Design an enzyme around this catalytic site. Structure first.
Site, PDB file in Angstrom:
ATOM      1  CG  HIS B  49       3.201  -2.497  16.149  1.00 20.04           C
ATOM      2  ND1 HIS B  49       1.875  -1.923  15.896  1.00 20.04           N
ATOM      3  CD2 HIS B  49       3.490  -1.716  14.529  1.00 20.04           C
ATOM      4  CE1 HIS B  49       1.251  -1.279  15.166  1.00 20.04           C
ATOM      5  NE2 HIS B  49       2.337  -1.230  14.267  1.00 20.04           N
ATOM      6  CB  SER B  72       3.443  -1.713  22.127  1.00 25.30           C
ATOM      7  OG  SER B  72       2.265  -1.478  20.513  1.00 25.30           O
ATOM      8  CB  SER B  77      -0.087  -4.110  17.674  1.00 25.29           C
ATOM      9  OG  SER B  77       0.813  -2.622  18.534  1.00 25.29           O
ATOM     10  CG  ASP B 127       4.808   1.323  13.212  1.00 24.45           C
ATOM     11  OD1 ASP B 127       4.119   2.116  13.256  1.00 24.45           O
ATOM     12  OD2 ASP B 127       5.723   0.429  13.791  1.00 24.45           O
ATOM     13  CD  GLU B 151       9.185   0.208  10.855  1.00 22.73           C
ATOM     14  OE1 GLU B 151       9.482  -1.201  10.534  1.00 22.73           O
ATOM     15  OE2 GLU B 151      10.727   0.748  10.844  1.00 22.73           O
ATOM     16  CG  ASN B 176       7.559   3.793   4.478  1.00 24.26           C
ATOM     17  OD1 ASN B 176       7.002   2.273   4.922  1.00 24.26           O
ATOM     18  ND2 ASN B 176       6.748   3.911   3.920  1.00 24.26           N
ATOM     19  CE  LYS B 181       8.343  -0.912   7.541  1.00 24.67           C
ATOM     20  NZ  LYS B 181       6.595   0.263   6.855  1.00 24.67           N
ATOM     21  CG  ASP B 185       7.415  -3.849   7.258  1.00 27.18           C
ATOM     22  OD1 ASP B 185       8.297  -4.016   8.326  1.00 27.18           O
ATOM     23  OD2 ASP B 185       6.227  -4.159   7.048  1.00 27.18           O
ATOM     24  CG  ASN B 186       5.214  -1.023   3.668  1.00 28.01           C
ATOM     25  OD1 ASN B 186       5.114  -0.278   3.565  1.00 28.01           O
ATOM     26  ND2 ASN B 186       6.393  -1.016   4.653  1.00 28.01           N
ATOM     27  CB  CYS B 190       0.651  -6.881   4.305  1.00 30.89           C
ATOM     28  SG  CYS B 190       0.735  -5.691   5.279  1.00 30.89           S
ATOM     29  CG  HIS B 296       0.197   3.598  11.648  1.00 31.26           C
ATOM     30  ND1 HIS B 296       0.644   2.726  12.359  1.00 31.26           N
ATOM     31  CD2 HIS B 296      -0.835   4.616  12.799  1.00 31.26           C
ATOM     32  CE1 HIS B 296       0.897   3.306  13.418  1.00 31.26           C
ATOM     33  NE2 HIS B 296       0.421   4.265  13.811  1.00 31.26           N
ATOM     34  CG  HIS B 348       4.726  -7.838   8.871  1.00 33.20           C
ATOM     35  ND1 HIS B 348       4.176  -8.117   7.776  1.00 33.20           N
ATOM     36  CD2 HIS B 348       5.060  -6.545   8.025  1.00 33.20           C
ATOM     37  CE1 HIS B 348       3.458  -6.893   8.130  1.00 33.20           C
ATOM     38  NE2 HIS B 348       4.105  -6.131   7.256  1.00 33.20           N
ATOM     39  CB  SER B 356      11.319  -3.286   8.704  1.00 34.26           C
ATOM     40  OG  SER B 356      11.115  -3.640   7.596  1.00 34.26           O
ATOM     41  CD  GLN B 360      13.145   2.237  12.992  1.00 37.13           C
ATOM     42  OE1 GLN B 360      13.719   3.091  12.710  1.00 37.13           O
ATOM     43  NE2 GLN B 360      11.676   2.965  12.619  1.00 37.13           N
TER      44      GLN B 360
HETATM   45  N1  LIG Z   1      -0.078  -2.945   8.889  1.00 33.58           N
HETATM   46  C1  LIG Z   1       1.075  -3.749   8.620  1.00 33.58           C
HETATM   47  O1  LIG Z   1       2.218  -4.319   9.291  1.00 33.58           O
HETATM   48  C2  LIG Z   1       1.569  -2.189   7.742  1.00 33.58           C
HETATM   49  C3  LIG Z   1       3.244  -2.380   7.346  1.00 33.58           C
HETATM   50  C4  LIG Z   1       2.920  -1.268   6.281  1.00 33.58           C
HETATM   51  C5  LIG Z   1       2.599  -0.926   6.674  1.00 33.58           C
HETATM   52  N2  LIG Z   1       1.656  -0.189   6.977  1.00 33.58           N
HETATM   53  C6  LIG Z   1       0.660   1.226   6.613  1.00 33.58           C
HETATM   54  O2  LIG Z   1      -0.756   0.977   5.745  1.00 33.58           O
HETATM   55  C7  LIG Z   1      -0.682   1.287   5.013  1.00 33.58           C
HETATM   56  C8  LIG Z   1      -0.489   1.602   3.434  1.00 33.58           C
HETATM   57  O3  LIG Z   1       0.746   1.886   3.641  1.00 33.58           O
HETATM   58  P1  LIG Z   1       1.227   1.408   2.358  1.00 33.58           P
HETATM   59  O4  LIG Z   1       2.768   1.888   1.912  1.00 33.58           O
HETATM   60  O5  LIG Z   1       0.467   0.338   0.743  1.00 33.58           O
HETATM   61  O6  LIG Z   1       0.890   3.041   1.340  1.00 33.58           O
HETATM   62  P2  LIG Z   1       0.984   2.987  -0.357  1.00 33.58           P
HETATM   63  O7  LIG Z   1       0.914   5.173  -0.196  1.00 33.58           O
HETATM   64  O8  LIG Z   1       2.101   3.116  -1.123  1.00 33.58           O
HETATM   65  O9  LIG Z   1      -1.010   3.358  -0.379  1.00 33.58           O
HETATM   66  C9  LIG Z   1      -2.026   3.212   0.120  1.00 33.58           C
HETATM   67  C10 LIG Z   1      -2.905   3.561  -1.556  1.00 33.58           C
HETATM   68  O10 LIG Z   1      -4.249   3.803  -1.040  1.00 33.58           O
HETATM   69  C11 LIG Z   1      -4.766   4.531  -1.800  1.00 33.58           C
HETATM   70  N3  LIG Z   1      -5.750   5.007  -1.405  1.00 33.58           N
HETATM   71  C12 LIG Z   1      -5.623   5.798  -1.026  1.00 33.58           C
HETATM   72  N4  LIG Z   1      -7.169   6.502  -0.533  1.00 33.58           N
HETATM   73  C13 LIG Z   1      -7.906   5.404  -1.133  1.00 33.58           C
HETATM   74  C14 LIG Z   1      -8.897   5.816  -1.460  1.00 33.58           C
HETATM   75  N5  LIG Z   1     -10.040   6.454  -0.513  1.00 33.58           N
HETATM   76  N6  LIG Z   1      -9.803   4.593  -1.643  1.00 33.58           N
HETATM   77  C15 LIG Z   1      -9.076   3.407  -2.476  1.00 33.58           C
HETATM   78  N7  LIG Z   1      -7.133   3.477  -2.507  1.00 33.58           N
HETATM   79  C16 LIG Z   1      -7.208   4.556  -2.095  1.00 33.58           C
HETATM   80  C17 LIG Z   1      -3.759   5.402  -2.701  1.00 33.58           C
HETATM   81  O11 LIG Z   1      -3.799   5.418  -4.035  1.00 33.58           O
HETATM   82  C18 LIG Z   1      -2.404   4.374  -2.578  1.00 33.58           C
HETATM   83  O12 LIG Z   1      -1.639   3.957  -3.261  1.00 33.58           O
HETATM   84  C19 LIG Z   1      -0.739   2.979   5.639  1.00 33.58           C
HETATM   85  O13 LIG Z   1      -1.515   3.547   6.719  1.00 33.58           O
HETATM   86  C20 LIG Z   1       1.166   2.059   6.596  1.00 33.58           C
HETATM   87  O14 LIG Z   1       1.385   2.600   8.012  1.00 33.58           O
HETATM   88  C21 LIG Z   1       0.529  -1.491   7.860  1.00 33.58           C
END
Ligand SMILES: NC(=O)c1ccc[n+]([C@@H]2O[C@H](COP(=O)([O-])OP(=O)(O)OC[C@H]3O[C@@H](n4cnc5c(N)ncnc54)[C@H](O)[C@@H]3O)[C@@H](O)[C@H]2O)c1
Ligand SMILES: NC(=O)c1ccc[n+]([C@@H]2O[C@H](COP(=O)([O-])OP(=O)(O)OC[C@H]3O[C@@H](n4cnc5c(N)ncnc54)[C@H](O)[C@@H]3O)[C@@H](O)[C@H]2O)c1
Ligand SMILES: NC(=O)c1ccc[n+]([C@@H]2O[C@H](COP(=O)([O-])OP(=O)(O)OC[C@H]3O[C@@H](n4cnc5c(N)ncnc54)[C@H](O)[C@@H]3O)[C@@H](O)[C@H]2O)c1
Ligand SMILES: NC(=O)c1ccc[n+]([C@@H]2O[C@H](COP(=O)([O-])OP(=O)(O)OC[C@H]3O[C@@H](n4cnc5c(N)ncnc54)[C@H](O)[C@@H]3O)[C@@H](O)[C@H]2O)c1
Ligand SMILES: Nc1ncnc2c1ncn2[C@@H]1O[C@H](CO)[C@@H](O)[C@H]1O
Ligand SMILES: Nc1ncnc2c1ncn2[C@@H]1O[C@H](CO)[C@@H](O)[C@H]1O
Ligand SMILES: Nc1ncnc2c1ncn2[C@@H]1O[C@H](CO)[C@@H](O)[C@H]1O
Ligand SMILES: Nc1ncnc2c1ncn2[C@@H]1O[C@H](CO)[C@@H](O)[C@H]1O
Lengths: 430, 430, 430, 430
Positions: B49, B72, B77, B127, B151, B176, B181, B185-186, B190, B296, B348, B356, B360
């Protein structure tokens, strides 16, 4: 057996009923594994806080076929009624609230005979493990130990590193369903309980110093802040410290707040946290307590040796008058305050903890002539498989009405797991 | 280069001065490693991004000696003044807010040419996994890449799927799953950037609303916390019983989407999985229900179905589309299902992105410096060493004024770590 | 009319469709009172922030029969698409984002002419007191105004100062001190709209920072809560021992600005008072300290001094000015000290503004309908009756799905109120 | 006098020392007003929970010159040690834990003679007030009553409305420093304390139903949620209900959650909240309690009459088995659970409450031949002046280290108050 008052068994039994209802995990394992008797002929020496909750664990292990003999792991944690309930039933138990160090190690020695030796260990803090290994002969005779708390597991790893681990060890503390529930949510309720039963102090408005910010510190900080305390946190680990800062807590040194804090809570599992350097600077009636496994986080020996007056306000609350004329209130002589001044963690969270303990014993005992859990030179520490960790959580959702979503085949494939789990890779931190 | 508007370089240069002061960790790596130039020789293909935060990352890599080409990893983004500033500085960037799927694809291919020599990259920084997929499945770079740093959770999920399938050829460092991280970050990222996206988008009140958070991993934990902090009543969906018990134990109803689909004002999807919010949910939603994704990829929401089956669609403003359904009621979809924090806001904040992006930088250094040491064969997935995890955290304490206690030798011996750490065992979950 | 850009009418019409659905209370007064037209004859002079929320207020008043002329009560609070939509609809509006002090003054005078007849207004609707001051001290409307409704604490403070001085000539209804305004808008509105202003302005991380909130009234309570919700460590300043004990009892350090001025990353002024953040504070602040005000007037911050004594000033973007001090360090000032929520964001969300603006509609109805009943002599300050306070709240429960228990007769008798209320005595503080 | 065990006086005295240190307000009034003896010859009959905290109040009133005789206001609230400490000292007190309704009213009758009548009333709940007025002759003899709780003050206003208030009444509950601290922050700590000492139930994960959302409900809800309960709230008042919704709680009817809730907490001050309609629908081992002044919020008479089995688990915990075979756990037979199963509010918050009580008695007693507080026909209910309300808060800031900012003359002028306060107009709600 030996307990304070066997008459209290009746009262003990009435509360074990309510404790059983609050432990759906332990009771389901009792239904599931009761018939097949997986611990047929097991000879478990247990060294773990003799509470009402441990009472339910003990009765599960016997239901699953095990012989068992029990001692507390702390001199103040035994609940005289739970011990009497176990004793009336006929399970050898040696525990009462207010044991001396001599009586304590006497009780632990009673559990290593009269089965005739044990063949399994169940321990909380590593005193039994170290003792069986360093003072008995039980190195051809013991097939496994299950270790419940962080300090005992630390102990276990110091032995593996050194080359002195002679029997396979199950690391129960580090099950996700123990570590991130018992240690965290348990202390979040049972800390303030002990503080309040001891002193009835108002938490709102006060400055509290929480030493350590691991799972225990996390819970204790959240509890104090929840009631309106301003919580400051100490840490040696940059990661844990940054977690505390990003949750809104000041991270500082004990010296930075020692003169102003109303409450000091020790959570590190490390000794010499609150010392002779700190005591004489503390404000009048500063309450000092520890929730980590050993009392040596606080220099109590020093406090006792250097205080000019000591008053028992009531059992497990000592008010000391210092050479400066101000007072220190010490809780439970520095022992685990939640168990020493209150009733420890509620039953529901201990059901998670003790389910892992039952699963652990089954894993080690049933697979004894298997070679999956090698003896002697090549003995190593293991965790419960992640499938079983998930099983335990699933057993506790129902009581709370939590509803779980079922993955479709495409979803499980897309995420890269089975439909029935395990759902996370082994490095996942939850 | 290829950006939207290069005259936005001036405005972006001004914000990067504030970003720099909010990223002490990245600026401290710029000072520490810039003199020795440990990424000299490095030819980094970047797919992350294109924000102000990534601009400070890209300039750190180039200060460290690397050549770098960027695109990106999401269509909405990019921050156009961020790209304009990097583009003026002489760094090749292909990135604007509102790339089509065609244009997105072109930009990525630009980053794999135009290095020096028959200058094909020798390194990847990813990423989401898309660059890794394109290079390994479709480009020729077969002998030419010494590593990829990944990432996010979704991108890392692919790396483990590939390794499992015998298709991982280039060494991968899982960024990640660094603690500094994933647990920062996560989680905390968020917790601030989700409601930022929603409010910038809709100006909607959170307080008083019913919000369905789907998934309760690190991202789900953060979003629920954020919504609840503003007085939303949050309900959670989960397939994992451990994560479900965590959400239940924090005060949240755990239910099925179908149990709240008719009453929820706000749906957030945080799963990293497809078809969470589907054709069976959409026609049931209350009028002006706000639907968004912070996972994602956008396919957690069936947006194609929504678009195919809405009677009316209206653009309130860019990335805020209001659909009228067959039933006459409306659904407000954010960023067409794209990451809402980056799509409708700025992602973020800098301070967390510094955690994060330090990871990297230290991952790229680790992979590239050992490019003729034979430590990462060109093939496994790796973690940053815990020592470097702690370092990252340690670099960010100063800005916040947090102070770290120093272990004595007695204390470090007692808890079984060096005085300067690593402080925790490799399996610690923080 | 006089707005910035009338071609933004289209975009504003689209958002007002979402605003309308988020303001059930105002739309429900539009349905209830529109048929009977109780403000027929009414000539309302309006001086309140020209936002999307006020657009739904202005159209409610005109649906109720009133003629209306409008101006914003702050130089940077207008939402230009809001004014463009109202201006197209035929309502006379004089308001754009970035009025000078001259231009601001002209707009207000426009609202006091151009009614029908020798059409001088017969009613005032005020936020801050400025219109009230101008009409009473400087216009001729002496025989012509039947009432003023006052929206905010600062404006109401003036009304009580005037009444005290024997200078209140027109009856005033205190709207700020309706419970459904003061305990909602001031509190929950600021809890969401403060961090909205800060983040839209700076994109800065809240988590981990030290924030000084100055004042702990309804606005101060909301801001501290918001910052703390994101992991800020909030410290509070107060002159009132009751408000101070509240903040202390909620977990916040109560100190003097001077105690935290060197370490705070964020200063928020919420007092309704002048010279909180002064020439003695500014040179002491850490680099890139963020300073803002959410009180009615900007003179809580000595911005003139800041401007006079900064070595450098830079516009990062509109309403975000970065000053370099004599010391070389920077101060980030938001909206030139103007209300930061309205200045750098969109103000409070619609749903809460519906509570406030219902009060304003029922206050105008109450004053105007009793304009020949002799109930409000043309002179005191009044409150909306508690019955109407409760009504406002009752109108907003449905959207959230909240359900109200109904008192039995026995129960209503026992607690000494009617079955349909008012439910509390006049002095209840909620 | 009459108490359970006079031997316990020693233990009682040791804890009164710690209680005194935690009540800096009461002790400062003892220093300030001790010498001048403002209650010289006062003859105060007290009807208020005989706790350790009331012990400090009683000893203050005697220090200020008053004669005093005391009874509890609840049959379970007396702390046998505080009563014995008062009795050893020689202050006539008639209270013990576990009084019958007959013994209770006997104790209250003992306090209305032997001074010989009283000339002042100090009451918590209105039983003494109603009794002295409706059953004695003390309508030429009593100069004032001080009333501490919401239900007693309700009582007082029902009398004023009816024309039956014959003596001036001080409304202590509605001092800001009582109402918004005791009722709120007190219950926030003392509810969970009683629940936990009674049942040791885990709050985390559970569904709790809190009936009422005034000051008591607010505190109880915040406490339960703080430990991870999902709290649902019931209300009859649209304003209070909307406050609950905007804080993230579901607002629903008791019938909506009666079958699923694990914990029922009554907080209304209204009867028949939990009834024969609810009991037979409750889940197994649903815990039922009340924290409002009278037990009739719960239909306990019905529960007892219609249950098939009752077991005393322990004192103040009754486990009933219903005709359906499931269980109900009732706490303290429906009496105030915080005082009945625990020790009530901590000392620090009661210092606020009881300071208002001391100030109240001084106000009414010293000004007895003044006509400021008229007797008979024209008797009316009064509040403490706002200056004194502020004084009490100021007395409690020091212990917490809260620092107050001093207004400049220009600031006080600008805000329209004195430099030394009062700072808010009389309608201010804090
Ligand atoms: N937008 C951002 O800036 C940002 C930042 C970090 C991560 N992410 C992305 O966000 C997403 C989540 O990341 P994370 O670290 O929480 O992953 P994570 O694996 O810790 O959490 C995802 C959760 O969803 C649950 N899950 C899976 N299928 C499901 C369903 N159908 N119904 C209900 N729950 C379900 C899982 O059990 C899991 O606990 C990923 O795609 C990651 O790449 C985005
Ligand atoms: N009382 C109970 O019912 C109960 C329950 C669970 C755990 N425990 C005990 O609590 C203790 C901690 O357990 P945990 O799971 O939180 O361990 P943990 O490793 O997660 O946390 C301990 C923390 O203290 C920090 N630390 C070490 N030395 C320090 C120092 N001197 N100053 C400040 N911080 C320091 C570490 O960096 C670590 O983060 C152990 O003794 C464990 O056995 C007790
Ligand atoms: N921006 C918005 O959308 C918005 C919304 C509502 C109200 N307001 C305005 O915000 C301001 C505050 O409103 P409120 O309802 O909280 O008023 P309030 O009177 O309840 O609170 C102001 C507080 O500031 C304290 N104070 C006064 N001088 C101080 C000093 N020098 N140092 C520290 N504290 C001091 C007072 O004791 C008081 O408690 C007012 O100007 C009001 O008009 C703005
Ligand atoms: N236990 C203690 O230590 C202690 C301390 C303070 C107050 N109290 C008692 O607590 C009770 C409440 O005090 P408070 O200050 O919160 O009163 P309050 O008036 O502020 O709150 C009571 C709430 O209950 C609501 N209500 C009335 N009938 C209802 C019904 N049937 N269903 C749902 N809600 C209903 C009212 O609308 C009100 O908001 C009183 O009896 C008071 O004497 C006890
Ligand atoms: N109640 C308990 N029983 C056994 N072990 C515990 C308990 N609490 C913490 N550790
Ligand atoms: N600001 C950001 N920059 C890059 N990646 C991100 C960001 N926020 C979340 N992920
Ligand atoms: N959105 C808004 N409109 C008008 N006045 C406000 C607003 N927010 C706070 N005060
Ligand atoms: N501890 C207490 N003492 C007297 N009255 C109370 C108490 N708590 C609530 N009301």
């Amino acid at each position: 057996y030996k307990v304070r008052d066997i008459s209290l068994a009746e009262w003990g039994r009435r509360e074990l009923e309510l404790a059983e209802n609050e432990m759906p995990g332990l009771m389901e394992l009792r239904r599931e594994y009761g018939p097949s008797k997986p611990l047929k002929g097991a000879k478990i020496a247990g060294c773990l806080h003799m509470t009402m909750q441990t009472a339910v664990l003990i009765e599960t292990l016997v239901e699953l076929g095990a012989e068992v003999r029990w001692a507390s792991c702390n001199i103040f944690s035994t609940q005289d009624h739970a011990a009497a309930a176990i004793a009336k039933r006929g399970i050898p138990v040696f525990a009462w609230k207010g044991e001396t160090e001599e009586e304590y190690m006497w009780c632990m020695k009673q559990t290593l005979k009269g089965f005739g030796y044990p063949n399994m260990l169940l321990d909380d803090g590593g005193d039994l493990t170290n003792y069986v290994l360093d003072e008995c002969e039980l190195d051809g005779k013991i097939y496994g130990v299950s270790e419940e708390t962080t300090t005992g597991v630390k102990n276990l790893y110091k032995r593996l590193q050194r080359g002195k681990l002679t029997i396979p060890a199950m690391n129960v503390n580090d099950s996700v369903t123990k570590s991130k529930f018992d240690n965290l949510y348990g202390c979040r309720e049972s800390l303030v309980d002990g503080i309040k039963r001891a002193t009835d102090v108002m938490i709102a408005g006060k400055t509290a110093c929480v030493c350590g910010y691991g799972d225990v510190g996390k819970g204790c900080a959240a509890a104090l802040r929840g009631f309106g305390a301003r919580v400051v946190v100490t840490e040696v680990d940059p990661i844990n410290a940054l977690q505390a800062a990003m949750e809104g807590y000041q991270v500082l040194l004990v010296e930075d707040v020692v003169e102003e804090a109303h409450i000091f809570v020790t959570t590190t599992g490390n000794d010499d946290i609150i010392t002779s350097e700190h005591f004489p600077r503390m404000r009048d009636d500063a309450i000092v307590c520890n929730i980590g496994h050993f009392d040596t986080e606080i220099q109590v020996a020093w406090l006792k040796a250097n205080a000019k007056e000591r008053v028992e306000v009531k059992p497990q609350v000592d008010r000391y008058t210092m050479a400066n004329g101000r007072h220190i209130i010490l809780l439970a002589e520095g022992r685990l305050v939640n168990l020493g001044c209150a009733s420890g963690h509620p039953s529901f969270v201990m059901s998670n903890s003790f389910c892992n303990q039952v699963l652990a014993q089954i894993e080690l005992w049933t697979n004894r002539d298997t070679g999956k859990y090698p003896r002697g030179a090549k003995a190593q520490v293991y965790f419960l498989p992640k499938k079983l960790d998930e099983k335990v959580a699933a057993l506790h959702l129902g009581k709370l009405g939590a509803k779980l979503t079922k993955l479709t085949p495409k979803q499980a494939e897309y995420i890269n797991c089975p439909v029935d789990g395990p759902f996370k890779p082994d490095h996942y931190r939850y």
